[PDB]
Structure 1
Amino acid sequence: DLSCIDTCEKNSVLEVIAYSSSETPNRHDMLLVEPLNRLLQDKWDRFVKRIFYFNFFVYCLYMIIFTAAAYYRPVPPYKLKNTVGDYFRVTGEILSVSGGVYFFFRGIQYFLQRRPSLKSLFVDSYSEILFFVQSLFMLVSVVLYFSQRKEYVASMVFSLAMGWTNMLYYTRGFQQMGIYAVMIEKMILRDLCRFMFVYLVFLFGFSTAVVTLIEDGKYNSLYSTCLELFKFTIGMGDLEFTENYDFKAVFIILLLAYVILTYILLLNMLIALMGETVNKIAQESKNIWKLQRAITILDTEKS
């Protein structure tokens, strides 16, 4: 029976389960129940699949237009000339700004309605806050643009990179790619910080040590030697990037100590983030993705 499960007009079980924050203990598998799973599957298949594909197509086309507008930028503001190229450029950047403001307004109204928990804003509403950040970046870009500064290009490239990386949102509706995106989100929020809480301190400590040792030269600045030490993580280290110093035994010892420590540090990261292999990762990701698809279904229904 479907009575007050969706259309109570006050509170529906599906709505409450969907919009429940991290406070709700057993949410992720709360949809495992058969009455909620079949209903959501039927609704999706019936119309939300088509609506979602249409929205994804429109968004991708928007991103292509924005990319084309940004790539061929003039080398502000710049007065449009009489040419097909100029007309297309102007209309493309107008459309990009029009998308930026629309995203801004959607994010504002979502924030006003939900009033997030002020602690779950990152673990929950990750995608929405990312979209809002993109909108803010582009809005500041245009503000700088019309303020006669050259930092609009910086704020535009930031927004464009954000937007391109935000295409993972639309993997939803696909089983495996959606699960893959869920695993990226979860692993970011879990270890991205934890793993680098010990890697950044190692890098900074050894960078300060080395730069103190280097008496004079090009690399006598903390930033340059920080980059040089970092380059080891890219598998591009030098081991002799400088020669202006004394006691080269100390320098070599420090460099090798850094190498060994960071390699066991990448050994610890790669292994300790094993997650819940087999034991409880073959169902947990599937449940999280199903929950997120339910969120999408409800939002597209109501919108």
Structure 2
Amino acid sequence: SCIDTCNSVLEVIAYSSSETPNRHDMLLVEPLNRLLQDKWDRFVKRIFYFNFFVYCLYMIIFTAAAYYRPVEGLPPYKLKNTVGDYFRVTGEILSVSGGVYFFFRGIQYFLQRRPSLKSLFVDSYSEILFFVQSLFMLVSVVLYFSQRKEYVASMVFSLAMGWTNMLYYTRGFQQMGIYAVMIEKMILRDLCRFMFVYLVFLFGFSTYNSLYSTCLELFKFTIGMGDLEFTFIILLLAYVILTYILLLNMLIALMGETVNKIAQESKNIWKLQRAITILDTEKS
């Protein structure tokens, strides 16, 4: 009573404000975990798999349509009486339809949920990312019909975001879903700290008579491609010792520490994500 559906307990815990002390732990309570697993294995596994298949088809069609884009200049491009041109245009139409679908789904989520502008950009990262991909697609359409070739820039950012968003569907499989929660926690905590310090050091040591060229040359060192003679020796050696040999290995060590302490927290967050998916599937 008032657990399955009512303010129901599951809808209270799942849609919490992200300040609740134990939002991730309240789902480990005896009857709730077994109820969510029952709902999953009964109907939400199949629905979620169908959604994943539909998204994979959408991304495949979008990739195919963008791959075979014409190179003539100043769109729109007139369609030729060729089967290939009829496949390309239908793929483009499907891509634009999916973008509109995701834009409207993001608007509906921001309306019915009313995030408080902090949990907006501190929780619900999936919704924002899909919405941002849809925004890129719509901006691409607008630029395309304005006779601007910058439509391709917006389209390729929509494609890389859409392919990186496939990591959303790792939830629904425990091992991959927890690995993806651990990727989120690495990005928010270790990559952020390392990137701040690393960027400060890089900009200082970079400050080839242009700032951009020298910054790129010094960044090549981070990826194992540094020249040491690209165009001084003490500065380059100091930069190498402080970034490559110290800061990048320290990042590995801190990543090892994080993984050791987030094991239980990563599983709870994945379970909460799947509970949110199960509630969304039930409501819609």
What range is the shorter-chain TM-score in?
A: over 0.9
Shift of 1:185: 1.2
CA shift at 1:29, angstroms?
1.2
Alpha-carbon distance between aligned partners in 2 of 1:152 and 1:267, rounded to the nearest angstrom: 37
1:47-97 deviations in Å (ceiling 9; x for gaps) = 000000001000100100000000000000001010100000000000000
In angstroms, what is the RMSD of aligned CA positions?
Answer: 1.4
Cα deviation digits, residues 132-172 of structure 1 (max 9, x gap): 00000111011000000000101000000000000010011
Aligned to 2:211: 222
**Equivalent position SS for 2:166:** helix
Using the size of structure 1 for normalisation, the TM-score is 0.89
What does residue 284 of structure 1 align with? Answer: 265
User: Which has the higher mean CA deviation after the structures are superposed, 268-277 or 285-294?
Assistant: 268-277
C-alpha separation in 2, matches of 1:98 and 1:14: 33
Residue 276 of structure 1: how far off its partner (Å)? 5.3
Deviation, 1:272, is 5.1
- Whole-angstrom CA distance in 1 between matches of 2:35 and 2:212: 57
Pairwise CA distance, 1:44: 0.3
- Structure 1, residues 112-148: CA drift from partner, whole Å, max 9, x if none? 1112121122331100000000000111011000000
Aligned-residue offset at 1:268 = 5.5
Q: CA deviation at 1:279?
A: 6.0
Q: Hey, what's the Cα distance between the residues in 1 that align with 2:114 and 2:253?
A: 35
Distance 1:277 1:160, change over 3 A: closer
In the alignment of these two chains, the number of paired residues is 280
CA separation of 1:30 and 1:162: change in aligned 2, threshold 3 A? same
In the aligned structure 1, how far is the partner of 2:130 from the partner of 2:120?
13
The partner residue of 1:237 within 211, 226, 239 is 226
3-state secondary structure, aligned to 2:54: helix
Work out the CA distance in 1 between the residues paired with 2:99 and 2:259: 42
For residues 241 and 278 of structure 1, do their structure 2 counterparts lie closer, same or farther at Cα, with a shift above 3 Å needed?
A: closer
Q: CA deviation at 1:284?
A: 1.4
CA contact (8 A) 1:275 1:281 kept: no
Work out whether residues 123 and 189 of structure 1, in 8 Å CA contact, stay in contact via their aligned partners in 2: no
Q: Cα distance 1:25–1:57, how it changes in 2: closer, same or farther (>3 A)?
A: same
State how far apart, in whole Å, the 1-side matches of 2:260 and 2:125 are: 27
**2:221–2:244 Cα contact (<8 Å) kept:** no
8 Å CA contact 1:4, 1:12 repeated in 2 = yes
Instruction: Decide which structure has the larger Cα Rg and report it.
Output: 1
- Name the structure where helix makes up a greater proportion of residues: 2
Question: 1:15-42 CA distances to partner (integer Å, 9 max, x unpaired)?
Answer: 0000002110111111111110000000
CA distance in 2, matches of 1:275, 1:241: 34
Distance in 2 (CA, whole Å) between partners of 1:298 and 1:292 is 10
Runs (4+) off by over 4 Å: 275-279
**How many Å apart are 1:180 and its aligned residue?**
0.7
* 1:195 shift after superposition: 1.2
Task: Work out the CA distance in 1 between the residues paired with 2:135 and 2:83.
Answer: 30
- Contact between 1:101 and 1:139, CA under 8 Å: does it hold in 2? yes
- Which sits farther off after the overlay, 191-200 or 144-153? 191-200
